[PDB]
Each structure stands twice: as structure tokens, then as C-alpha cells.
């Protein structure tokens, strides 16, 4: 005979925005991988990463020799014009995250000694990628090393 209480917040979650946040998210988290990152949020996070990268570069003793830097899209683009291209990027906060070595490239080229092919195979470039990533994880003044 008695009529139980009307449970309005569930109905507010129905009729305003037609879904149900109220269920344990362990269903969706355990079964389904998370949603892929869209646009907008990408541009905002890249802009914040550009600002954090500027402020992290002005503190560290950057190599002042020929490394002209462009914060272009969260990637500092350390490029000496003669020989070498580096792209660096921090992951988290400003103080304590190390650097990631997103793309390393060697600009030195002669199309005759290297027999019409690249001077250095991607195997060796990836090896130097691991070595410089390790010496970044040594956490000295990193850019000089």
C-alpha cells in the first residue's frame, strides 16, 4: 500500500541530459578502452604545453651555439642547421618532468658515399634515440649533454 519516495535526482538526470552517469564506471572502464582525444581539447593542451615549454626553456641553460628553437606545437625543434634535428617535449608539469625525444634526425647527407641512400639507417638513429633518451633520464642539465 505504501508508495516509495520519488527519487527525483535520477529523473533530473534523465530528462535534462538523456543519460545516466549514476552507474559504476568500472563497467565502461574495465570493458571499453577510453575515448580518443578530439580536436579543441587538443589545441588547448598544445597551447598550454607551448607556454610550459617556453617557461621551462627560459630556466634551463639552453645550448646557445647554433640551436635556433621554435616552440612550434609543443615541440621545441632544436635544429642546428648543419647536421642535426631534434624535437623535444615535456609531458607533465613545469618543475620535474624529463624530456621526450619525439623525433631525432641527421641532416648530414652525401648521395655518393652513401650509395644514393641515407647516410644512417633508422636502426642506428633509433639506437642514438635510446642513448640520448637515457642521458636525458640521467637528469643533469640535460640540453648541454
Amino acid at each position: 500500500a505504501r508508495l516509495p519516495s520519488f527519487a527525483i535526482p535520477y529523473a533530473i538526470d534523465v530528462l535534462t541530459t538523456g543519460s545516466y552517469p549514476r552507474l559504476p564506471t568500472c563497467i565502461r572502464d574495465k570493458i571499453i578502452p577510453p575515448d580518443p582525444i578530439t580536436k579543441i581539447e587538443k589545441q588547448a593542451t598544445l597551447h598550454q604545453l607551448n607556454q610550459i615549454l617556453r617557461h621551462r626553456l627560459v630556466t634551463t641553460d639552453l645550448p646557445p651555439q647554433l640551436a635556433n628553437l621554435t616552440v612550434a606545437n609543443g615541440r621545441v625543434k632544436f635544429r642546428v642547421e648543419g647536421e642535426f634535428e631534434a624535437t623535444l617535449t615535456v609531458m607533465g608539469d613545469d618543475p620535474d618532468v624529463p624530456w621526450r625525444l619525439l623525433k631525432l634526425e641527421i641532416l648530414v647527407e652525401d648521395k655518393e658515399t652513401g650509395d644514393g641512400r641515407a647516410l644512417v639507417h633508422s636502426m642506428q638513429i633509433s639506437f642514438i634515440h635510446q642513448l640520448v633518451q637515457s642521458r636525458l633520464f640521467a637528469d643533469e642539465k640535460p640540453l648541454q649533454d
Binding site: T113, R117, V120, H121, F137
Partner: peptide, 25 residues
């Protein structure tokens, strides 16, 4: 239901890079 055969010299240079700059975990 390659390798252009000038990689011996690059590899020796890699070993010299390993010695002159060691990896650091």
C-alpha cells in the same frame, strides 16, 4: 581465413659514441 655497406664505419662510430657517452638509467 636495406643496408648500404658503409654501415661498418657508422657502427664503429656508434661504439665510439657508446664509450664517449655512456647510457645512464
Amino acid at each position: 581465413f636495406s643496408s648500404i655497406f658503409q654501415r661498418q664505419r657508422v657502427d664503429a662510430l656508434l661504439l665510439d659514441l657508446r664509450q664517449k657517452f655512456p647510457p645512464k638509467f
